[PDB]
Structure 1
Amino acid sequence: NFFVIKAKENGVNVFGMTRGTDTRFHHSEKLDKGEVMIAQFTEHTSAVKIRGKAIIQTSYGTLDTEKDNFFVIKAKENGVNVFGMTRGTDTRFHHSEKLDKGEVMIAQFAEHASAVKIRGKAIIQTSYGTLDTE
């Protein structure tokens, strides 16, 4: 699937994380107020990160950061962290992406990892419905 980002201010940044064993951001793009971006998940990229005031549209619904198979994480407060579990018999926990208040994350279940653990106060969007940690 594909997602849409609209910038409500200047300073909105988006990051692309590689599909593979490790989860780090390799590219970053800057959006100005009123600009809109459309992107699709590809072989290289399986997840993205969003920071700043912006509007996000997805099949699950439309999400705004100012308000107070794939999944979406929105950080309600500071200290939000997410971990990913390795596929197969392996039992490692090596993924550490911290989301500050107002930031948003989107990721897909790939071969290298198809199970995720989430920490802190955040809002989760899924095909079933919307979930609030608090």
Structure 2
Amino acid sequence: SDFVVIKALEDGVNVIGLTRGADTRFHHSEKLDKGEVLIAQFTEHTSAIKVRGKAYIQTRHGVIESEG
């Protein structure tokens, strides 16, 4: 099952899980401060992930960067 790597490039970046299922709402928001790395799978509970704030992101499709 795949995962995504998120490195925060400033304080207060939010990595947000969206619920798997008929319903789509947030469920959890993990706060990363500058320099922290989160490596997060898709799961039974999470089928979409949003990143808000400035971060360096790696997936199986390559690098992408979110901007705050």
TM-score (norm 2): 0.91
2:36 equivalent in structure 1 = 35
Question: What CA distance in whole angstroms lies between the structure 2 residues aligned with 1:60 and 1:26?
Answer: 25
Q: Which runs of 5+ in 1 are unaligned?
A: 66-101, 104-134
Unaligned runs of 5+ in 2: none
CA deviations over 1:46-86 (Å, ceiling 9, x no partner):
01111111000011111112xxxxxxxxxxxxxxxxxxxxx
Q: Name the structure 2 match of 1:69.
A: none
Q: Which amino acid aligns with 2:19?
A: T
Larger radius of gyration: 1
**Which of structures 1 and 2 has the larger relative contact order (alpha carbons within 8 angstroms, sep 6+)?**
2
Name the SS of the counterpart of 1:56 in structure 2: strand
The Cα RMSD (Å) is 1.1
| Counterparts of residues 90-129 of structure 1 (less than 5 Å) | 102=67
State the SS of the aligned residue for 1:4: strand
Task: Show structure 1 runs of 4+ deviating over 6 A.
Answer: none
Give the count of matched residue pairs: 67
